[PDB]
Write an enzyme that holds these catalytic residues in place. Structure first.
Site, short mmCIF file in Angstrom:
data_model
loop_
_atom_site.label_atom_id
_atom_site.label_comp_id
_atom_site.label_asym_id
_atom_site.label_seq_id
_atom_site.Cartn_x
_atom_site.Cartn_y
_atom_site.Cartn_z
N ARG A 17 0.50 7.96 5.18
CA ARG A 17 -0.42 8.70 4.33
C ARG A 17 -1.90 8.73 4.73
O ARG A 17 -2.41 7.82 5.40
CB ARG A 17 -0.32 8.20 2.88
CG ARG A 17 0.95 8.63 2.15
CD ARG A 17 1.05 8.02 0.76
NE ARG A 17 1.23 6.57 0.79
CZ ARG A 17 1.37 5.80 -0.29
NH1 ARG A 17 1.34 6.34 -1.50
NH2 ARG A 17 1.53 4.49 -0.16
N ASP B 296 3.34 3.17 6.32
CA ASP B 296 2.69 4.19 5.51
C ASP B 296 1.94 5.15 6.42
O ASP B 296 1.03 4.75 7.15
CB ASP B 296 1.74 3.53 4.51
CG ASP B 296 1.71 4.25 3.18
OD1 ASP B 296 1.27 5.42 3.15
OD2 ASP B 296 2.14 3.65 2.17
N1 LIG Z 1 9.74 5.93 3.08
C1 LIG Z 1 9.95 5.69 1.77
N2 LIG Z 1 9.08 6.18 0.85
C2 LIG Z 1 9.41 5.88 -0.49
C3 LIG Z 1 10.51 5.13 -0.95
N3 LIG Z 1 10.47 5.05 -2.36
C4 LIG Z 1 9.40 5.71 -2.68
N4 LIG Z 1 8.69 6.25 -1.60
C5 LIG Z 1 7.41 7.07 -1.54
O1 LIG Z 1 6.31 6.15 -1.62
C6 LIG Z 1 5.24 6.71 -2.45
C7 LIG Z 1 4.92 5.82 -3.64
O2 LIG Z 1 5.15 4.45 -3.36
P1 LIG Z 1 3.92 3.44 -3.18
O3 LIG Z 1 4.74 2.19 -2.92
O4 LIG Z 1 3.07 4.04 -2.23
C8 LIG Z 1 3.38 3.61 -4.90
P2 LIG Z 1 1.65 4.04 -5.09
O5 LIG Z 1 1.36 4.80 -3.82
O6 LIG Z 1 1.72 4.76 -6.27
O7 LIG Z 1 1.15 2.44 -5.08
P3 LIG Z 1 0.71 1.53 -6.37
O8 LIG Z 1 -0.33 2.11 -7.18
O9 LIG Z 1 0.35 0.19 -5.89
O10 LIG Z 1 1.90 1.39 -7.28
C9 LIG Z 1 5.69 8.08 -2.94
O11 LIG Z 1 4.94 9.09 -2.21
C10 LIG Z 1 7.20 8.05 -2.68
O12 LIG Z 1 7.69 9.34 -2.31
C11 LIG Z 1 11.46 4.59 0.06
O13 LIG Z 1 12.48 3.92 -0.12
N5 LIG Z 1 11.09 4.94 1.40
#
Ligand SMILES: Nc1nc2c(ncn2[C@@H]2O[C@H](COP(=O)(O)CP(=O)(O)OP(=O)(O)O)[C@@H](O)[C@H]2O)c(=O)[nH]1
Ligand SMILES: Nc1nc2c(ncn2[C@@H]2O[C@H](COP(=O)(O)CP(=O)(O)OP(=O)(O)O)[C@@H](O)[C@H]2O)c(=O)[nH]1
Ligand SMILES: [Mg+2]
Ligand SMILES: [Zn+2]
Ligand SMILES: [Zn+2]
Lengths: 173, 168
Positions: free
Chosen positions: A128, A126
């Site tokens: 981010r 990650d």
């Molecule tokens: N590098 C990758 N990024 C992905 C993939 N699938 C989704 N994403 C990215 O990851 C981000 C969301 O996934 P997360 O697992 O971080 C979900 P969030 O951040 O919303 O976490 P939670 O609240 O715990 O659900 C989002 O910005 C997507 O664009 C993948 O296969 N590879």
């Protein structure tokens, strides 16, 4: 503060009106947005969801991920709460970008999962930076936050990034 | 050619699989994407929709515009055709940007309309023409309800041989 609040407008949705606030990164000019439901003032912790933008899931009906469902679910729970916030964190593919996310799926269309799919593309698990989200809350006059998430490790990260998460909340998906 | 095709992957959706192709502007690094349904090869004109990205409508359920509905409608008609393309033209708010689109709604939340410091449409569709070329597409049957769009897109270099009403 790395962002600046540059504008807001009424965003009518099937759950009612949301105040949508536009943010601009001071250093890059990149945009981010927040959707405010109800009156977020008050010493009462605010219910909020930090959503990281995912074009495929959020707008292109991708079934390859549940980003779109999580997005709809959050707005729903926030609407049902009558007071809340959704931060649309525009850091596509965990900050690596859309194109990189596509070439990651291209590699996953071979076997390798998310983690090594990035170490190969040169990125970490990650990439981010959530301090920007902390900044959006601040600019929205928000302190205590009840975070919508099913990942406990996220709370650790977001509070770490400077967000005063006083309570967790599971997401219905 | 102002773009380069940099990657593609399978995009599974409720209408089936789409081949999603990622594009990068050579001069800016900006991304754009296309969704290909079925086999687009063949001298048969290809059914396609040129959708200009609209975050509020496309992802945030905005009722202030029908971008989201048009988006879903196009994918549906393309799926029903069994062969087609959707160009997701990432030029938010008619190329002025999301932030500007919001401060435009802020003014529309006041007095002014969709025409008051930019022009009516600042978009550059030659990029879309480039995506088609990179996809090996020539003749195009364009999905749109605006006849003036065909004039513009063909103008931008797209060999539109037919306008096809977009049913919503
Ligand atoms: N590098 C990758 N990024 C992905 C993939 N699938 C989704 N994403 C990215 O990851 C981000 C969301 O996934 P997360 O697992 O971080 C979900 P969030 O951040 O919303 O976490 P939670 O609240 O715990 O659900 C989002 O910005 C997507 O664009 C993948 O296969 N590879
Ligand atoms: N400045 C404004 N931009 C808008 C407004 N409504 C939509 N849009 C933006 O315009 C773009 C698409 O809307 P158009 O009305 O131009 C649809 P298109 O050009 O695709 O016409 P059709 O093929 O006939 O559907 C999209 O990127 C939107 O973000 C508005 O009131 N003001
Ligand atoms: Mg459009
Ligand atoms: Zn996703
Ligand atoms: Zn729109």
């Amino acid at each position: 503060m790395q962002l600046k609040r540059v504008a807001e407008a009424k965003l009518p949705t099937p759950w009612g009106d949301f105040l949508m606030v536009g943010f601009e990164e001071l250093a890059t000019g990149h945009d981010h947005v927040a959707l405010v439901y109800g009156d977020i003032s008050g010493h009462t912790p605010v219910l909020a969801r930090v959503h990281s933008e995912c074009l495929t899931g959020d707008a292109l009906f991708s079934l390859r991920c549940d980003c779109g469902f999580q997005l709809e679910a959050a707005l729903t729970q926030i609407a049902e709460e009558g007071r809340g916030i959704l931060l649309y964190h525009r850091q596509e593919g965990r900050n690596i970008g859309l194109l990189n996310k596509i070439r990651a799926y291209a590699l996953q269309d071979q076997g390798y999962d998310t983690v090594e799919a990035n170490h190969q593309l040169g990125f970490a698990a990650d990439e981010r930076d959530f301090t920007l989200c902390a900044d959006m809350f601040k600019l929205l006059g928000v302190n205590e936050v009840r975070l919508l998430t099913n990942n406990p490790k996220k709370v650790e990260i977001l509070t770490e990034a400077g967000i005063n998460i006083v309570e967790r909340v599971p997401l219905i998906v």
